């Protein structure tokens, strides 16, 4: 029994052990209360404005589009405190923990950016934060592990399984049934069991709300498409939500194609995986033929979640959103191109969304089109991955 | 088949509780697993719970995590586990055999085909660890069409609505996760399948205690799996110490 | 002959070779034109809003001040595109280059942040950018050198002298007399020969203008003091300017005290150096007894300019502003303290201003005071300097 | 003293231009510097321009940058340069001696004391490289009170107001930085100090050319300093090749 629908068509649900259901039902009920509570909305808006720096700019990029009929804007989540969109929803979740009287935060993270987000929000809001991170990702994300520790969080390496993000996701789900009374699990994307796909969407939907107001001010009409990369689905659904009912607006999600979809070394389960059940949800998964879950491969470490949020698999199935893939070398080209022609260093995750906008422009240069890319994060973290390869 | 109903009648005729060990199939390899299992039965197990190795066993602690690691280091797959199960059933026709599965392995290539495969090899029950009663309808219905008992866990704090649903939906036994006196009587009140206490059971006095509280028996897994873990480079020591533990635990269950 | 006064009391002036005077007089005249030209003001404001992300937040820090009568706000220049306040004035200078018809930009830089700023602005505005950097700073600022190159600028190592920032300043001043016809010299702080102290102040004065509007909205009165670190003087004079005529507002500048002013290993020439003439100006300098210029020492590499802007030496001499110093270990403590209690990683330069606010609070905990620290930059760049030391 | 006025009268009596070499004092060390200087004079220099090593010589190219590097590697300081100058004056009473200074070394411990020190040791002129005419008033006034000629550079594009100011403010010679025909005649028109062409002069034909255009002579520095640079590990070769160059350059200046 729930207050809100846990599925999006066939996808979603609550596939957790029985002992975790009360934690999900309690979080659902707190969230429906807070969404109606004007005091919680004004505390969240004040943190997003005066702490995190909302609203973020919408930047036109006239040097990239010259000599074509594409007009491209970038929604600047890279300017948000923390350098990526993940801050928005951690702040909301942290305030939901406090409204439930919890004192402690559990989070998982892969490339480290959700861990840092969760540790900043827990330091600001006086929550005790512990993070699980696969030990192969602790070893390769020295700078984020240190940030987390500077901010007072406990980083717990996970050595089981593949010692990467899905193994840290399992460890969070093993700790919460013994701690949900005083600890909230601040999940890092719009996936997992209900209510998380719906809570993370609602706490990221200001991306698209601001983008609609900003593009109507600057061009007097909505975009022809909004384009966002898709690791687990949070930044894209936060850009897409306020546009779902504007039927002329395209919604394009970009999954990582890694070394190319034919090589099998990619992270594109929505269009190239198979539906399974894991991490609390029915959704498309990277998995073997016999149903073992596998890792996603991308040059961008932040597109490593090995499934996808259930609302994107549903918006794909009905034809409302379209999902594509971009390979490591297209993402790298788009990162170099934004650095040199607009003086903006984009995260390599967001570089996959920019790469697809560049192909829409270059493939049809005389097509008139108004495009917004969600620039989910800044890419200072990537500059020597980009160095070492070139 | 009604192997659990047959068992619990037999054990009620003797005022005896069941003692049910858990192991991961294939740990530490198929041949040694099949000897471990035969040792458990000869030493007195009344029924078996058996795990199919899964990449992400999000409801299990470190001892079973590491059992699954060992089985995958041996190349164990779900199809090799179903070959093992058919062999174990052909040696042992009456002991009840339950699987502990993760959902994706049952949903993989189709839930009704997974329960049909169970029925063909002679499995009696399946507990899917990450399917709560609220998500259970296609699993329980497919289990019942293929004469497989769907097992549910009753959590320690289960409210009344949850007790009534586990009662109604489960068969075979109720997995009562580990003063259970109230949840045990409520289960009987609602005509639930008989309760087996599980989690943490590692010594004879707990076996005795679960039967005195009114449960039909007790399940133990990590304690059995730690004996495997401890004895890997002496397979014959492994069998002997498994025999000593199970014989002790089942003796605690006798009246 | 000039349009505007090149001195602030005794300090300032135009001490360059004769062959450079026409470049300064041309830049002065372009700047007085652009300051009256409403089109140039609207092109600069649109870049600062939609490209750089102005206005930046003013964040109250209630966890740091608990149990005292200090209320502290941080002006969030760390959220500006590029991560530090230097972006504001590079954008202005770049538009002044284009208004003079120049196609090329010359800049110097030390820790690399001005080089990156100048390279981002030159990429956005289609200027060809070359930067001079001491070769000992190229070697130790690998990440910034790479950013610059990603953004299309030419980085030229300077091996003469001490191969640090002052040696790159000399090399810019040697290239400009042969190139001022088509190249503008985008100086990196509020120092150097007139008109640079005045142009950089005016192009950073939005810091303080926004801070005054924001603190009147949030507290209904002006601050008791605004506090900023002082390397060359740009972020501080950009915070101080709009408050100079509000006589009740304290203006506190913080120079680096390094290992301590008695050791001689510091970067505090305003209060502990001697007036000299170098880099185009009469101002307090780090220099030997016989007049050789020396380097500034600080744990923060960005407080390395070995003099100070002339308007701060003048505001000190008349008593309008007060200048203090903070040592490397006080700055490090203030960096750790903001990370753990507010989830903000500050640059180590700005950590010197926060350290002094913390001492004003801790030294007198029952004094009622409203303080604003200008948080000039973010400190992701410092996290392993901070690691390796701890 | 009026050493420059005496010189240019003497050289006008012979329809001859001046040839004035530049070196950094102390490069590559005090003793070798003092022999280099004596060699320049014996080979025919009419006047000397001499640099005091400064940490940040922002108006100089690489050859002189490196001369100052070498002098600092030898421990040369401004006080040691003034000892050198007193020695050079006591050996050579009539040759004019000009300093090329950076401002901070003149302002250091007081502008009037710096020009008084010049006058005590027998220096005739001082060019401060980074003091434009607009900032020159305390320097030129202090120079004139201590009978030192303040030298100014006239840039190649100097407008009329700048020509008139260099004319009025300079003494000794005008440094005409390197078709100067118009700037030379304008300087004469305004009664400027006689012009010496400087920057780039490295061969005899330019010496001839500067005198034909109407200048009173020419200064050369990098070319002299490169001979030092080239010959460091053979001090005696260094002296001989300096002698050969200066004798050539001064012969180009004769009528
Ligand atoms: C983590 C991250 C992503 C991917 O996560 P989503 O939930 O799909 O948004 C994308 N961009 C940045 C910059 C990230 O840090
Ligand atoms: C360069 C820099 C400084 C010092 O320069 P000022 O001109 O004194 O402002 C201060 N903070 C940051 C973050 C810097 O990058
Ligand atoms: Na994914
Ligand atoms: Na300084």
mmCIF file of C-alpha atoms in Angstrom, chain C residues 166-371:
data_model
loop_
_atom_site.group_PDB
_atom_site.id
_atom_site.type_symbol
_atom_site.label_atom_id
_atom_site.label_comp_id
_atom_site.label_asym_id
_atom_site.label_seq_id
_atom_site.Cartn_x
_atom_site.Cartn_y
_atom_site.Cartn_z
ATOM 1 C CA UNK C 166 57.523 39.207 -11.176
ATOM 2 C CA UNK C 167 59.680 37.855 -13.960
ATOM 3 C CA UNK C 168 56.556 37.168 -15.995
ATOM 4 C CA UNK C 169 55.344 40.708 -15.269
ATOM 5 C CA UNK C 170 58.640 42.047 -16.686
ATOM 6 C CA UNK C 171 58.247 39.905 -19.819
ATOM 7 C CA UNK C 172 54.806 41.204 -20.511
ATOM 8 C CA UNK C 173 56.114 44.728 -20.195
ATOM 9 C CA UNK C 174 58.930 43.896 -22.611
ATOM 10 C CA UNK C 175 56.530 42.485 -25.272
ATOM 11 C CA UNK C 176 53.853 45.186 -25.175
ATOM 12 C CA UNK C 177 55.869 48.160 -26.629
ATOM 13 C CA UNK C 178 56.331 46.089 -29.824
ATOM 14 C CA UNK C 179 52.744 44.877 -29.941
ATOM 15 C CA UNK C 180 50.276 47.458 -28.418
ATOM 16 C CA UNK C 181 48.819 48.270 -31.768
ATOM 17 C CA UNK C 182 47.005 45.050 -32.053
ATOM 18 C CA UNK C 183 47.498 43.534 -28.506
ATOM 19 C CA UNK C 184 46.073 44.632 -25.226
ATOM 20 C CA UNK C 185 47.988 43.705 -21.934
ATOM 21 C CA UNK C 186 45.374 42.255 -19.532
ATOM 22 C CA UNK C 187 46.964 42.875 -16.255
ATOM 23 C CA UNK C 188 45.850 40.590 -13.413
ATOM 24 C CA UNK C 189 45.330 42.732 -10.337
ATOM 25 C CA UNK C 190 44.657 46.308 -9.194
ATOM 26 C CA UNK C 191 48.201 47.355 -9.515
ATOM 27 C CA UNK C 192 50.730 48.295 -12.149
ATOM 28 C CA UNK C 193 50.799 51.632 -13.929
ATOM 29 C CA UNK C 194 47.742 53.799 -14.335
ATOM 30 C CA UNK C 195 45.162 53.178 -15.548
ATOM 31 C CA UNK C 196 45.221 49.586 -14.383
ATOM 32 C CA UNK C 197 44.474 50.134 -10.559
ATOM 33 C CA UNK C 198 41.488 52.165 -11.466
ATOM 34 C CA UNK C 199 40.203 49.918 -14.387
ATOM 35 C CA UNK C 200 40.513 46.678 -12.301
ATOM 36 C CA UNK C 201 38.691 48.329 -9.323
ATOM 37 C CA UNK C 202 35.856 49.457 -11.557
ATOM 38 C CA UNK C 203 35.591 46.078 -13.142
ATOM 39 C CA UNK C 204 35.452 44.313 -9.805
ATOM 40 C CA UNK C 205 33.224 46.852 -7.887
ATOM 41 C CA UNK C 206 30.118 44.722 -8.524
ATOM 42 C CA UNK C 207 31.400 42.487 -5.627
ATOM 43 C CA UNK C 208 30.750 45.164 -3.097
ATOM 44 C CA UNK C 209 27.727 46.639 -4.852
ATOM 45 C CA UNK C 210 25.945 43.280 -4.747
ATOM 46 C CA UNK C 211 27.130 42.646 -1.105
ATOM 47 C CA UNK C 212 25.594 45.996 0.006
ATOM 48 C CA UNK C 213 22.241 45.210 -1.639
ATOM 49 C CA UNK C 214 22.236 41.691 -0.346
ATOM 50 C CA UNK C 215 23.124 42.581 3.264
ATOM 51 C CA UNK C 216 20.548 45.399 3.366
ATOM 52 C CA UNK C 217 17.919 42.876 2.157
ATOM 53 C CA UNK C 218 18.878 40.287 4.651
ATOM 54 C CA UNK C 219 19.819 42.302 7.826
ATOM 55 C CA UNK C 220 18.484 45.843 7.079
ATOM 56 C CA UNK C 221 21.773 47.588 7.717
ATOM 57 C CA UNK C 222 25.374 47.592 6.514
ATOM 58 C CA UNK C 223 28.115 45.370 7.785
ATOM 59 C CA UNK C 224 30.298 46.335 10.713
ATOM 60 C CA UNK C 225 33.321 45.243 8.502
ATOM 61 C CA UNK C 226 34.078 43.614 5.194
ATOM 62 C CA UNK C 227 37.181 41.511 5.115
ATOM 63 C CA UNK C 228 39.202 40.377 2.062
ATOM 64 C CA UNK C 229 42.575 38.897 1.381
ATOM 65 C CA UNK C 230 45.193 41.100 -0.411
ATOM 66 C CA UNK C 231 47.665 39.522 -2.922
ATOM 67 C CA UNK C 232 47.743 42.398 -5.433
ATOM 68 C CA UNK C 233 44.465 43.950 -4.220
ATOM 69 C CA UNK C 234 41.754 43.197 -6.813
ATOM 70 C CA UNK C 235 39.190 41.218 -4.867
ATOM 71 C CA UNK C 236 39.561 43.458 -1.880
ATOM 72 C CA UNK C 237 39.222 46.698 -3.680
ATOM 73 C CA UNK C 238 36.196 45.189 -5.594
ATOM 74 C CA UNK C 239 34.606 44.474 -2.160
ATOM 75 C CA UNK C 240 35.657 47.721 -0.586
ATOM 76 C CA UNK C 241 34.863 50.303 -3.266
ATOM 77 C CA UNK C 242 31.131 50.719 -2.869
ATOM 78 C CA UNK C 243 31.621 50.933 0.916
ATOM 79 C CA UNK C 244 34.496 53.610 0.985
ATOM 80 C CA UNK C 245 32.015 56.401 1.574
ATOM 81 C CA UNK C 246 30.000 54.440 4.213
ATOM 82 C CA UNK C 247 32.269 55.596 7.014
ATOM 83 C CA UNK C 248 30.880 53.155 9.655
ATOM 84 C CA UNK C 249 31.799 50.131 7.555
ATOM 85 C CA UNK C 250 35.323 48.745 8.434
ATOM 86 C CA UNK C 251 37.503 47.720 5.503
ATOM 87 C CA UNK C 252 40.002 45.058 6.598
ATOM 88 C CA UNK C 253 42.574 43.669 4.136
ATOM 89 C CA UNK C 254 44.517 40.579 4.981
ATOM 90 C CA UNK C 255 48.011 40.017 3.690
ATOM 91 C CA UNK C 256 49.784 36.624 4.001
ATOM 92 C CA UNK C 257 51.988 36.322 6.989
ATOM 93 C CA UNK C 258 53.599 33.049 5.671
ATOM 94 C CA UNK C 259 55.711 31.454 8.390
ATOM 95 C CA UNK C 260 55.254 34.573 10.538
ATOM 96 C CA UNK C 261 56.235 38.268 9.990
ATOM 97 C CA UNK C 262 59.385 37.905 12.239
ATOM 98 C CA UNK C 263 60.746 35.130 10.059
ATOM 99 C CA UNK C 264 60.865 37.416 7.065
ATOM 100 C CA UNK C 265 59.183 34.608 5.023
ATOM 101 C CA UNK C 266 55.815 36.409 4.355
ATOM 102 C CA UNK C 267 53.987 38.362 1.623
ATOM 103 C CA UNK C 268 52.936 41.428 3.504
ATOM 104 C CA UNK C 269 54.559 44.428 1.875
ATOM 105 C CA UNK C 270 51.800 46.984 2.720
ATOM 106 C CA UNK C 271 52.491 46.717 6.412
ATOM 107 C CA UNK C 272 56.022 45.173 6.479
ATOM 108 C CA UNK C 273 57.741 46.178 3.171
ATOM 109 C CA UNK C 274 59.115 49.617 1.974
ATOM 110 C CA UNK C 275 57.839 51.873 -0.727
ATOM 111 C CA UNK C 276 59.634 51.444 -4.042
ATOM 112 C CA UNK C 277 59.084 51.867 -7.729
ATOM 113 C CA UNK C 278 58.584 48.809 -9.874
ATOM 114 C CA UNK C 279 56.029 47.381 -12.238
ATOM 115 C CA UNK C 280 54.929 50.688 -13.308
ATOM 116 C CA UNK C 281 54.022 52.085 -9.940
ATOM 117 C CA UNK C 282 55.211 53.609 -6.613
ATOM 118 C CA UNK C 283 53.914 51.303 -3.888
ATOM 119 C CA UNK C 284 55.101 49.163 -0.926
ATOM 120 C CA UNK C 285 57.352 46.340 -2.228
ATOM 121 C CA UNK C 286 59.074 43.204 -1.031
ATOM 122 C CA UNK C 287 62.695 44.324 -1.612
ATOM 123 C CA UNK C 288 66.107 43.968 -0.272
ATOM 124 C CA UNK C 289 67.922 46.855 1.663
ATOM 125 C CA UNK C 290 69.617 47.817 -1.520
ATOM 126 C CA UNK C 291 66.458 47.858 -3.641
ATOM 127 C CA UNK C 292 66.427 44.480 -5.444
ATOM 128 C CA UNK C 293 62.768 43.177 -5.676
ATOM 129 C CA UNK C 294 62.055 39.951 -3.862
ATOM 130 C CA UNK C 295 59.262 37.318 -4.019
ATOM 131 C CA UNK C 296 56.302 37.109 -1.572
ATOM 132 C CA UNK C 297 56.098 33.805 0.435
ATOM 133 C CA UNK C 298 52.780 32.216 1.318
ATOM 134 C CA UNK C 299 51.353 28.754 1.472
ATOM 135 C CA UNK C 300 48.826 30.130 -0.976
ATOM 136 C CA UNK C 301 50.329 30.468 -4.279
ATOM 137 C CA UNK C 302 47.916 33.140 -5.409
ATOM 138 C CA UNK C 303 49.008 35.694 -2.815
ATOM 139 C CA UNK C 304 52.481 35.897 -4.621
ATOM 140 C CA UNK C 305 52.418 39.425 -6.066
ATOM 141 C CA UNK C 306 55.385 41.102 -4.338
ATOM 142 C CA UNK C 307 53.774 44.511 -3.914
ATOM 143 C CA UNK C 308 50.266 45.768 -3.481
ATOM 144 C CA UNK C 309 47.848 47.984 -5.339
ATOM 145 C CA UNK C 310 48.419 51.705 -4.710
ATOM 146 C CA UNK C 311 44.823 52.468 -3.646
ATOM 147 C CA UNK C 312 45.237 50.064 -0.659
ATOM 148 C CA UNK C 313 48.504 51.771 0.429
ATOM 149 C CA UNK C 314 46.571 55.094 0.213
ATOM 150 C CA UNK C 315 43.457 53.859 2.071
ATOM 151 C CA UNK C 316 45.874 52.545 4.803
ATOM 152 C CA UNK C 317 47.738 55.863 5.031
ATOM 153 C CA UNK C 318 44.608 57.899 5.663
ATOM 154 C CA UNK C 319 43.175 55.370 8.099
ATOM 155 C CA UNK C 320 40.143 54.401 6.051
ATOM 156 C CA UNK C 321 41.162 50.759 5.707
ATOM 157 C CA UNK C 322 43.111 48.562 8.107
ATOM 158 C CA UNK C 323 45.462 45.854 6.991
ATOM 159 C CA UNK C 324 46.528 42.741 9.022
ATOM 160 C CA UNK C 325 48.278 39.484 8.333
ATOM 161 C CA UNK C 326 47.405 35.763 8.833
ATOM 162 C CA UNK C 327 49.928 32.993 8.839
ATOM 163 C CA UNK C 328 49.981 29.835 6.849
ATOM 164 C CA UNK C 329 48.766 27.742 9.823
ATOM 165 C CA UNK C 330 45.854 30.168 10.597
ATOM 166 C CA UNK C 331 44.785 29.999 6.947
ATOM 167 C CA UNK C 332 44.980 26.210 6.990
ATOM 168 C CA UNK C 333 42.799 26.082 10.151
ATOM 169 C CA UNK C 334 40.200 28.345 8.587
ATOM 170 C CA UNK C 335 40.135 26.167 5.452
ATOM 171 C CA UNK C 336 39.519 23.066 7.519
ATOM 172 C CA UNK C 337 36.955 24.764 9.619
ATOM 173 C CA UNK C 338 34.787 25.972 6.607
ATOM 174 C CA UNK C 339 34.992 22.560 4.907
ATOM 175 C CA UNK C 340 33.751 20.735 8.082
ATOM 176 C CA UNK C 341 31.157 23.222 9.371
ATOM 177 C CA UNK C 342 29.656 24.770 6.241
ATOM 178 C CA UNK C 343 30.519 22.215 3.443
ATOM 179 C CA UNK C 344 32.325 24.892 1.439
ATOM 180 C CA UNK C 345 35.976 24.336 0.304
ATOM 181 C CA UNK C 346 37.567 27.820 0.166
ATOM 182 C CA UNK C 347 40.685 28.794 -1.762
ATOM 183 C CA UNK C 348 43.667 29.106 0.519
ATOM 184 C CA UNK C 349 43.960 32.773 -0.522
ATOM 185 C CA UNK C 350 40.404 33.469 0.737
ATOM 186 C CA UNK C 351 41.088 31.317 3.811
ATOM 187 C CA UNK C 352 43.352 34.138 5.022
ATOM 188 C CA UNK C 353 40.332 36.553 5.097
ATOM 189 C CA UNK C 354 38.145 33.866 6.835
ATOM 190 C CA UNK C 355 40.936 33.259 9.384
ATOM 191 C CA UNK C 356 40.938 36.889 10.359
ATOM 192 C CA UNK C 357 37.116 36.934 10.767
ATOM 193 C CA UNK C 358 37.394 33.863 12.925
ATOM 194 C CA UNK C 359 39.986 35.581 15.136
ATOM 195 C CA UNK C 360 37.668 38.740 15.412
ATOM 196 C CA UNK C 361 34.863 36.344 16.599
ATOM 197 C CA UNK C 362 36.952 34.071 18.829
ATOM 198 C CA UNK C 363 39.035 36.914 20.469
ATOM 199 C CA UNK C 364 35.794 38.745 21.521
ATOM 200 C CA UNK C 365 32.966 36.210 21.509
ATOM 201 C CA UNK C 366 30.407 38.430 23.175
ATOM 202 C CA UNK C 367 31.018 41.402 20.830
ATOM 203 C CA UNK C 368 28.030 41.907 18.534
ATOM 204 C CA UNK C 369 29.308 42.185 15.057
ATOM 205 C CA UNK C 370 28.072 41.704 11.453
ATOM 206 C CA UNK C 371 30.959 40.571 9.234
#
